[PDB]
Amino acid sequence: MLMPRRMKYRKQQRGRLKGATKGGDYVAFGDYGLVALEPAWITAQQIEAARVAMVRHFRRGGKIFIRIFPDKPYTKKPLEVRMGKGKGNVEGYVAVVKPGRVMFEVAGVTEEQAMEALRIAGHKLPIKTKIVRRDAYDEAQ
Amino acid sequence: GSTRNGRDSQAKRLGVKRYEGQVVRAGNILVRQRGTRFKPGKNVGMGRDFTLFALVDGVVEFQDRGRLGRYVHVRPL
Amino acid sequence: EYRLKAYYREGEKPSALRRAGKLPGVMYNRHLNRKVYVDLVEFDKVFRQASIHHVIVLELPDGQSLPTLVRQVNLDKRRRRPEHVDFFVLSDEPVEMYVPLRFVEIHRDILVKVSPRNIPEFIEVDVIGDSLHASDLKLPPGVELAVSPEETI
Amino acid sequence: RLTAYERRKFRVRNRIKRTGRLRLSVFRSLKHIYAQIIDDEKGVTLVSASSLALKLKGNKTEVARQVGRALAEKALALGIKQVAFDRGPYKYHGRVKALAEGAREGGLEF
């Protein structure tokens, strides 16, 4: 499971999920990528669930690129406590993902293997996704 | 938490007090700042807390000199 | 070895053009700068095989067949579609641009300056735990390396 | 980068220009010595004297004293009395000191 090794600040404010993706919008490392279609907080558990599913489906071969990282701390108050008395404790980490962001790539596999592995990985994620392949537009960037 | 945090200090109301083209009298405070964000130009003095004040009656003029800094002048009438 | 029809535009709103299935763009070099537009499906079919490497000849309604190169494609992040195209107009001077690579990972377009008349199409490289640098390129006659000498490919 | 010479020149002259007077600027080469009276507000030179133009030859400290007298005599005909002495990178001593006393003996207020 991913998380930053060091942090300047333990807790962050809940920001905003506005706008299309800032960076990471084109396939850059692999041959087939999974692209987000709507914004969400993607937790570290969901990232690992998707990665392991591709590893199992890629028996022997395959190399997987994870292009998102959960750097944002996620906070929760303990059960049965009232409002107030400070911000809740850190319970996990999420990655802020906006539409157009390429989340995963794969390489070293056939086309059939890539489409099935990325399809299963998407079922582990809380958002609608699409599968893309590297094209001239990605190389033009 | 609600025990570790909870402190702050009063706001200081810093910034430029008179802008370019305004007519000022001698002694008028022109800038409140921490350090030399603006530098004293012609007919401008600096106090011990980097406050810029006019030395003569006149018109405020702002100037940017690149690597030499930003200057505030008072041009006499 | 590619052709495409381009139409001049003056003041039509680019959002209006895109709703009509068109693609706003610009063409320029150190002498000219003209606003144009092209048909979106026609450009897409050419660009998938003619990337920033190959020359595209634009047919204008003024009777001039200008040989251009794509310098920039601006994509619509949400819809993964091109919203603007920059066309660099070729001339007699040498030009730096990205030629394709032929393998038989790190890069897919090695940058070299070259004349328009000696643009090469294939750069074949023969491929455990090692690495391939750009220093091992064949470098056919007519080009000069426009990258760092120690780039890994 | 700056040298001790360049830092010294700036440090002395920035103090002088703060006062808003006319600055008496002195340049001292291995051979000669030169003096200008400068108005920084307009950026023009009012009067200038040197041992090169006057063809003064002798002991350098003696030469510099006569250059100060000539600059002082030149200054008063133009209605200047009050100036500020700008030593630049030079210590107030020797040839530069001799020029200052010569200017003061000629009727300059500094």
Added chain:
RNA sequence: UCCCCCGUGCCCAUAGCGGCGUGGAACCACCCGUUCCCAUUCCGAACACGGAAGUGAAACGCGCCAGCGCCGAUGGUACUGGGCGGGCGACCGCCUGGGAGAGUAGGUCGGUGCGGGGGA
């Protein structure tokens, strides 16, 4: 009015780093000494003075070079003042006015004022 040098400004890298060439007639510098004025937490290195045997090697000035650095359009986009809509929500569209950052083409090995010395 032309050119070279010396001093002092302004604009504040389009002015810079780096590479190559060049200048001693004049100026400037290095240089020769340390009795004298003055000086080194030791040292004439620095600061200072007295000079003219030598040299433009160093420094400085002046030229050429776009490798780096800096400047940088047009076009399009993001965002947005105002006016209207959609979506269970996260959020998203349309009209009207404004409009980046990055990237591209490209530009740049400064510009200019005052004074002084010399030559044409």
Added chain:
RNA sequence: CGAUCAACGGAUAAAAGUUACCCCGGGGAUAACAGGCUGAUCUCCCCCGAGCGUCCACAGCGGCGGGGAGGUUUGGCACCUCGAUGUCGGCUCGUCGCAUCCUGGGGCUGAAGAAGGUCCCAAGGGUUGGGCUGUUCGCCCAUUAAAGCGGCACGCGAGCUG
């Protein structure tokens, strides 16, 4: 000059507890019950298919993750009620929902038969007596076709009990 007048615009030079023996003025400006909004918690249903199942992902199962429904639990909030909305269990009397415990009808089965497992349809009728404990709950005894789960101010004290 004498200030942890630090509860730092500093009631006196000088000051702690307890009340189920309690009292008055007020508040639904504010808690405990019930309702309400919400649904983290709770119950149920789906998606994905790693893997189990002699062989075989899907007879029966479903790692890691994902999407919902319900409004029975524990909470969050403090919106009507503090010039009063009686609060557990039992008794009596019911009535409704179906996510069905039995009885009726079906598909599949890793269904020979008999007996089961699982899902679909189905709310007409039914769903026992007793020991322990104030208990709800639960355990136990003897049975049964079966000994269902919930709502109705956790139904029901101007109906009883206490």
Added chain:
RNA sequence: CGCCUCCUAAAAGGUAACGGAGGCGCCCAAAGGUCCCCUCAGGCGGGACGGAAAUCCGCCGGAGAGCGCAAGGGUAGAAGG
């Protein structure tokens, strides 16, 4: 529970929560005035004891050092030695 710094704070100022992070209740007789002089951290190479790191020499290095104590602003054309 008073005071200082940053964020929240929506590019003037101001702006709340038992919101997110840290400090203060001193000190200095020079750590004050003025005049004069000087310029860092770091890296690379060389040098008895001597090293990761003492003191010495050369080169690059524009502020990444320092400025009594938090943080921010400022600052070598000094506010630093």
Added chain:
RNA sequence: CUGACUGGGGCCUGUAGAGCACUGAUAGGGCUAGGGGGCCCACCAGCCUACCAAACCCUGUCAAACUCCGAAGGGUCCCAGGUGGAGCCUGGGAGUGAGGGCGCGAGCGAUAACGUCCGCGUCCGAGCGCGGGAACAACCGAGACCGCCAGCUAAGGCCCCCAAGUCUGGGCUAAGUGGUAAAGGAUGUGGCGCCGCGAAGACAGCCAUGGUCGAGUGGCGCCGCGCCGAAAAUGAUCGGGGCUUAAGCCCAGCGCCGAAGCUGCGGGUCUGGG
């Protein structure tokens, strides 16, 4: 005449966005100070690593307390328009110092609450007066001095309840969808595309790649409107009746109905000017 508001001009700012120059975070690869073992060998070192990892190089990202950048706006001054139950000065009299909903920008909360805490605006409060929204403080329309059996409009409507079109033209839906929900699933349906194979006789059927077969057919993409997914407790229902080339949805027209808004006619009253 100085006001809110507006026009021109200058100056001030570090948010949105963006970026990686600083401070932190961070993915893949290359090169390697130093690590784990290692062929070892302590006489002495290189080397092996499909195990880490400093700097550096390439590619690729993140930030309320990061910034090489940087808007739209906002603030302020000067000049100009602005005569308004505008502004400024002096004094008398207060009340208020429990707010609330909605929209946008944030924090807290679980990106829950008819939740809580601020900022900018708005309305209710005090407009529980009026029209629409079935009913309904704050959603839409609109600021009620009085009278009229006059007229035009607003939001919203024009099949009946119920005032006005069973109006006109083009298209879609078959689910009573319209008239209450997601991931996911599907030869529903209509419209457009990209490709493939086709009397170099194809897909299906039939005898086994060959004959039989004689006009098309197969694979993907997008769009509109629908279907399943979909279980709660007194009696049901879109407000009701009812509605299917609609009385549903989408596009375009003309007309009408519709308020205490506006106009017409008459009257009262406040302020200012003749």
